[PDB]
Design a protein around this motif. Sequence first.
Motif, PDB file in Angstrom:
ATOM      1  N   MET A  64      41.860  34.152  31.301  1.00 22.03           N
ATOM      2  CA  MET A  64      42.712  34.864  30.340  1.00 22.03           C
ATOM      3  C   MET A  64      44.197  34.988  30.870  1.00 22.03           C
ATOM      4  SD  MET A  64      40.992  38.509  29.162  1.00 22.03           S
ATOM      5  CE  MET A  64      41.907  38.693  27.503  1.00 22.03           C
ATOM      6  N   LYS A  65      44.453  34.886  32.050  1.00 24.25           N
ATOM      7  CA  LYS A  65      45.866  34.939  32.754  1.00 24.25           C
ATOM      8  C   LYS A  65      46.612  36.132  32.308  1.00 24.25           C
ATOM      9  CE  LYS A  65      45.560  29.954  33.813  1.00 24.25           C
ATOM     10  NZ  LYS A  65      46.259  28.476  33.725  1.00 24.25           N
ATOM     11  N   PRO A  66      46.109  37.334  32.282  1.00 26.79           N
ATOM     12  CA  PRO A  66      46.977  38.336  31.732  1.00 26.79           C
ATOM     13  C   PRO A  66      48.433  38.331  32.106  1.00 26.79           C
ATOM     14  CG  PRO A  66      44.864  38.945  32.427  1.00 26.79           C
ATOM     15  CD  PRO A  66      44.959  37.657  32.990  1.00 26.79           C
ATOM     16  N   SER A  67      49.419  38.866  31.622  1.00 27.14           N
ATOM     17  CA  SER A  67      50.860  38.998  32.144  1.00 27.14           C
ATOM     18  C   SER A  67      50.663  39.970  32.746  1.00 27.14           C
ATOM     19  CB  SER A  67      51.602  38.986  30.749  1.00 27.14           C
ATOM     20  OG  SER A  67      51.701  40.204  30.101  1.00 27.14           O
ATOM     21  N   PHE A  68      49.867  41.168  32.490  1.00 26.16           N
ATOM     22  CA  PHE A  68      49.993  42.405  33.212  1.00 26.16           C
ATOM     23  C   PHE A  68      48.807  43.055  32.696  1.00 26.16           C
ATOM     24  CE2 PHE A  68      51.842  46.664  34.363  1.00 26.16           C
ATOM     25  CZ  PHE A  68      52.437  46.515  35.159  1.00 26.16           C
ATOM     26  N   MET A  69      48.203  43.833  33.612  1.00 30.83           N
ATOM     27  CA  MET A  69      47.157  44.507  33.322  1.00 30.83           C
ATOM     28  C   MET A  69      47.195  46.073  33.576  1.00 30.83           C
ATOM     29  SD  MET A  69      44.206  42.336  34.980  1.00 30.83           S
ATOM     30  CE  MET A  69      44.695  42.381  36.699  1.00 30.83           C
ATOM     31  N   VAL A  70      46.823  47.062  32.938  1.00 34.78           N
ATOM     32  CA  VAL A  70      46.751  48.365  33.144  1.00 34.78           C
ATOM     33  C   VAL A  70      45.386  49.286  33.186  1.00 34.78           C
ATOM     34  CG1 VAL A  70      48.992  48.797  31.969  1.00 34.78           C
ATOM     35  CG2 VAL A  70      47.122  48.562  30.563  1.00 34.78           C
ATOM     36  N   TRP A  71      45.509  50.147  34.067  1.00 34.22           N
ATOM     37  CA  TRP A  71      44.044  50.845  34.321  1.00 34.22           C
ATOM     38  C   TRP A  71      44.518  52.325  34.572  1.00 34.22           C
ATOM     39  CZ3 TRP A  71      46.172  46.916  37.502  1.00 34.22           C
ATOM     40  CH2 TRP A  71      46.671  47.263  38.839  1.00 34.22           C
ATOM     41  N   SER A  72      43.490  52.979  34.785  1.00 40.91           N
ATOM     42  CA  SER A  72      43.670  54.456  35.142  1.00 40.91           C
ATOM     43  C   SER A  72      43.399  54.743  36.700  1.00 40.91           C
ATOM     44  CB  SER A  72      42.616  55.172  34.584  1.00 40.91           C
ATOM     45  OG  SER A  72      42.800  55.365  32.820  1.00 40.91           O
ATOM     46  N   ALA A  73      44.360  55.396  37.406  1.00 44.45           N
ATOM     47  CA  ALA A  73      44.162  55.565  38.683  1.00 44.45           C
ATOM     48  C   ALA A  73      42.864  56.358  38.871  1.00 44.45           C
ATOM     49  CB  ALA A  73      45.442  56.319  39.236  1.00 44.45           C
ATOM     50  N   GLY A  74      42.304  55.914  40.242  1.00 43.04           N
ATOM     51  CA  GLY A  74      41.280  56.535  40.893  1.00 43.04           C
ATOM     52  C   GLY A  74      39.905  56.212  40.032  1.00 43.04           C
ATOM     53  N   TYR A  75      39.905  55.555  39.143  1.00 43.41           N
ATOM     54  CA  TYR A  75      39.021  54.913  38.201  1.00 43.41           C
ATOM     55  C   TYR A  75      38.652  53.568  38.252  1.00 43.41           C
ATOM     56  CZ  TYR A  75      35.451  54.615  34.278  1.00 43.41           C
ATOM     57  OH  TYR A  75      34.401  54.264  33.644  1.00 43.41           O
ATOM     58  N   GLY A  76      37.482  53.104  38.197  1.00 40.24           N
ATOM     59  CA  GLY A  76      37.300  51.660  37.981  1.00 40.24           C
ATOM     60  C   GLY A  76      37.348  50.626  39.246  1.00 40.24           C
ATOM     61  N   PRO A  77      37.759  49.369  38.847  1.00 41.19           N
ATOM     62  CA  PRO A  77      37.899  48.631  40.116  1.00 41.19           C
ATOM     63  C   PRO A  77      38.900  48.699  41.452  1.00 41.19           C
ATOM     64  CG  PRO A  77      37.191  47.371  38.350  1.00 41.19           C
ATOM     65  CD  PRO A  77      37.837  48.570  37.962  1.00 41.19           C
ATOM     66  N   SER A  78      39.011  48.379  42.417  1.00 42.71           N
ATOM     67  CA  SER A  78      39.974  48.749  43.448  1.00 42.71           C
ATOM     68  C   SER A  78      41.174  48.176  43.103  1.00 42.71           C
ATOM     69  CB  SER A  78      39.520  47.919  44.658  1.00 42.71           C
ATOM     70  OG  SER A  78      40.639  48.368  45.676  1.00 42.71           O
ATOM     71  N   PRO A  79      42.312  48.867  43.248  1.00 43.61           N
ATOM     72  CA  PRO A  79      43.961  48.361  42.830  1.00 43.61           C
ATOM     73  C   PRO A  79      44.114  47.037  43.591  1.00 43.61           C
ATOM     74  CG  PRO A  79      44.111  50.173  44.190  1.00 43.61           C
ATOM     75  CD  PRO A  79      42.543  50.152  44.025  1.00 43.61           C
ATOM     76  N   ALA A  83      44.986  43.481  41.709  1.00 46.43           N
ATOM     77  CA  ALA A  83      46.300  42.725  42.080  1.00 46.43           C
ATOM     78  C   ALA A  83      46.014  41.494  42.360  1.00 46.43           C
ATOM     79  CB  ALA A  83      47.149  43.832  42.886  1.00 46.43           C
ATOM     80  N   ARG A  84      44.917  40.995  42.501  1.00 45.26           N
ATOM     81  CA  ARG A  84      44.568  39.667  43.034  1.00 45.26           C
ATOM     82  C   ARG A  84      44.510  38.765  41.667  1.00 45.26           C
ATOM     83  N   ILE A  85      44.099  39.342  40.587  1.00 43.03           N
ATOM     84  CA  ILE A  85      43.985  38.716  39.302  1.00 43.03           C
ATOM     85  C   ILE A  85      45.163  38.480  38.560  1.00 43.03           C
ATOM     86  CG2 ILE A  85      42.825  38.531  37.139  1.00 43.03           C
ATOM     87  CD1 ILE A  85      40.893  40.674  38.282  1.00 43.03           C
ATOM     88  N   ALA A  86      46.229  39.699  38.641  1.00 42.93           N
ATOM     89  CA  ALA A  86      47.408  39.464  37.994  1.00 42.93           C
ATOM     90  C   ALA A  86      48.016  40.762  37.945  1.00 42.93           C
ATOM     91  CB  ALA A  86      47.242  39.257  36.387  1.00 42.93           C
ATOM     92  N   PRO A  87      49.491  40.789  37.773  1.00 48.70           N
ATOM     93  CA  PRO A  87      50.300  41.898  38.184  1.00 48.70           C
ATOM     94  C   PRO A  87      49.705  43.017  36.990  1.00 48.70           C
ATOM     95  CG  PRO A  87      51.830  40.168  38.022  1.00 48.70           C
ATOM     96  CD  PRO A  87      50.414  39.801  37.533  1.00 48.70           C
ATOM     97  N   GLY A  88      49.820  44.516  37.593  1.00 48.35           N
ATOM     98  CA  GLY A  88      49.287  45.432  36.671  1.00 48.35           C
ATOM     99  C   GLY A  88      49.721  46.838  37.288  1.00 48.35           C
ATOM    100  N   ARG A  89      49.577  47.855  36.615  1.00 46.55           N
ATOM    101  CA  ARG A  89      49.954  49.247  36.981  1.00 46.55           C
ATOM    102  C   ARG A  89      48.959  50.289  36.628  1.00 46.55           C
ATOM    103  NH1 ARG A  89      54.567  51.772  36.335  1.00 46.55           N
ATOM    104  NH2 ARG A  89      55.585  50.519  37.926  1.00 46.55           N
ATOM    105  N   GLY A  90      48.499  51.013  37.569  1.00 49.36           N
ATOM    106  CA  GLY A  90      47.664  52.164  37.367  1.00 49.36           C
ATOM    107  C   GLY A  90      48.345  53.503  36.791  1.00 49.36           C
TER     108      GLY A  90
END
Length: 262
Positions: A64-79, A83-90
Amino acid sequence: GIDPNRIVALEWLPVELLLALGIVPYGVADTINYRLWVSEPPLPDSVIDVGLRTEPNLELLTEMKPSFMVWSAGYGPSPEMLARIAPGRGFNFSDGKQPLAMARKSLTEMADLLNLQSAAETHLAQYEDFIRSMKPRFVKRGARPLLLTTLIDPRHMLVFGPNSLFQEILDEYGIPNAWQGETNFWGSTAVSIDRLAAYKDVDVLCFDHDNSKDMDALMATPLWQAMPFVRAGRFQRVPAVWFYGATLSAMHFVRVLDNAIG
């Protein structure tokens, strides 16, 4: 998040934030269940399902090559991992005490990233005004405490406490929250059905999530029919409303709440 049309949301908290700001998520983790638990802010069919929020399809994400990825802190995969996949913010759901305060800060922080400050302010005013407007829909039903729950399985119920998303809303309407026991960081805790029998005179709402087979099993038990608040005619099954969302989840709750006891 440079390109706004290429953002992948890996949790339903940040999906809600994007939606409130008008962004259409390039990708979203677990769109199937999103239908059952969040339901509101339906997702346009274009959205690409990226898998489970806990174990997202890392292969897909890479393609996909996301431009950015958002997630919920403390939940899901390791930040670190992500960050190795694409930029993002928890994003944080709460500070452990006030989820809605945090939601407002998260909404603003999201906007800033995307320079949608105006859209953020419009929504927030729409939001605060809507909460205020419904206040008089709960002036009659005085100080009777309310209990918010949802069934996880026949032997367990989730109760939502003082630090849950709904608390601030209750405070603004003067609805006492029947649950003052303990709660996790997210504002809830699982209890045994019997624990609920302790609630004599209180209003009880139970968010559904395509679990009627489960409800019937529960309403079938003699314990349930024995339930005091049930016999008092104070039990209600209401539509799904996401308990770990933001402003759209709070406005969805006020709707369900209004219909249920307004």
